[PDB]
Amino acid sequence: MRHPLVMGNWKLNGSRHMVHELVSNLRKELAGVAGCAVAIAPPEMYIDMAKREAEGSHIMLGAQNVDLNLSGAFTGETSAAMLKDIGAQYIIIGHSERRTYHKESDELIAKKFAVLKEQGLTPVLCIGETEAENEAGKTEEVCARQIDAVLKTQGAAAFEGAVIAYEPVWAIGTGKSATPAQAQAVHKFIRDHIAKVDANIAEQVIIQYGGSVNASNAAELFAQPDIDGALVGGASLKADAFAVIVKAAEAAKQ
Amino acid sequence: MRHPLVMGNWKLNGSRHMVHELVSNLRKELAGVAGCAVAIAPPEMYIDMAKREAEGSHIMLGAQNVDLNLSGAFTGETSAAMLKDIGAQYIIIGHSERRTYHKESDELIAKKFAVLKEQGLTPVLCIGETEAENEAGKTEEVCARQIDAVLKTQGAAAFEGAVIAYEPVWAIGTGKSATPAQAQAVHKFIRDHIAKVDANIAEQVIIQYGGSVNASNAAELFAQPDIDGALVGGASLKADAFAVIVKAAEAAKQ
């Protein structure tokens, strides 16, 4: 029932030249793709440009973060109202890089979620456990805590039209691997957790895998019933590699 | 000897419609200005649009913040390389709103200053004391410390072509305001502080007043010898008001 979504998180990579080349190449590589939705999140200053270059394609826009205010005396902040105005749809919040580097709390990320829903934007809520948490067997505990920050304060209806990306931080560039079976176990837990509150809402949430995915990984991952796509890091900077993942998602969901 | 600079810090205010209207109005209101440089800092997502709207005018672009990395796996950050690529020149760092709301340290801001210099961008270094600091008589100690973060790590040569903006934070929302005499005493102190290290650099640094500046009070402030312009808040959102401030600077320094 769930239409897959593959989203490219460019992280801190981009330039006028790069945006033109990558978006152009993405359109070409994604020709004929109909069975998987596609979004990209360039650095904020390139969203407008990327949106322009994406005309004629099915590539949707997004962003890498948002702050809490819509307007006012908040020098250097990002407004959900302005993201909407410039045409970004899918807004990444709570990425592990921000939770760690910028000490973003569960409570803060939940507030970001609320402002996005209020504006009618799509949160891509990133959740996931550390090396120590995984080793301690606290995967489920951590994921539930990070989800509950929204679910307990905003209700199950907050997740209508929302996306969750599970990041196995313990497995990302660490020497440790996470299997499709292991990913499916977590995705299943996440959906079940929401279902305890509202089964209908749980059934429609898009749960993306945010761990390492490549051409060797994609088909086995996307065959899993509770994995609805992928939030892609480094591979999103190469049109061919990114399109391989998109096409694998399309093929797996048939 | 110093050519004034009036810069508009739009803060968290903007939309595509607003950018078009405001920049168009700015172009018209400022078309006959010769004796004052002008920069604007829209929200990050609108820099590209504003730069394109300003083409043909003397309105220079800027931004409200920058982070430390040029590229890499830093979701949601702002790159100095990208700010340059998109056409921003004048980069506000250490604004009181960011020192307070986002806990940015003196040391972090000095690091931002260094990254900007390496990219050939112009830092607009914001400094200023709080209500508690001002009441404790620590105006000079605080300004000196905030400047010293750069001065004692990068030398006076770092301030070549750079801009300082003094914000009396104690005057924000307190129902209080600095007189031109008070503002001038602080600007004179800042310049003398740099002159202790390099007198020639001190004489060429643009020191902007960053407290409340409007069409009404601009003339009296710009009559002061060590006030080289203004970092303007709310009045930067209305072209007519902003133009009065620019012209007052031109007239005062003519």
UniProtKB/Swiss-Prot annotation, chains A, B:
Binding positions for substrate per the UniProt entry: N9, W10, K11, G173, S212, G233, G234
Keyword annotations: Cytoplasm, Gluconeogenesis, Glycolysis, Isomerase
Molecular function as annotated in GO: triose-phosphate isomerase activity
Localisation per UniProt entry: Cytoplasm
Enzyme Commission code: 5.3.1.1
Pathway it works in: Carbohydrate biosynthesis; gluconeogenesis; Carbohydrate degradation; glycolysis; D-glyceraldehyde 3-phosphate from glycerone phosphate: step 1/1
GO terms classed as biological process: gluconeogenesis; glyceraldehyde-3-phosphate biosynthetic process; glycerol catabolic process; glycolytic process
Catalytic center residues: H95, E167
Signal peptide: none
Pfam family name, one: TIM
Entry superkingdom: Bacteria
An example Gene Ontology CC term for this record: cytosol
Catalytic activity: D-glyceraldehyde 3-phosphate = dihydroxyacetone phosphate
Residues that span the membrane, as ranges: none
UniProt keyword Lipid biosynthesis present: no
Role played: Involved in the gluconeogenesis. Catalyzes stereospecifically the conversion of dihydroxyacetone phosphate (DHAP) to D-glyceraldehyde-3-phosphate (G3P).
Family: Belongs to the triosephosphate isomerase family.
HAMAP family assigned: TIM_B (MF_00147_B)
NCBIfam families: tim (TIGR00419)
Record text on subunit structure and interactions: Homodimer.
UniProt-recorded name of the protein: Triosephosphate isomerase
Lineage of the species this protein comes from: Bacteria, Pseudomonadati, Pseudomonadota, Gammaproteobacteria, Enterobacterales
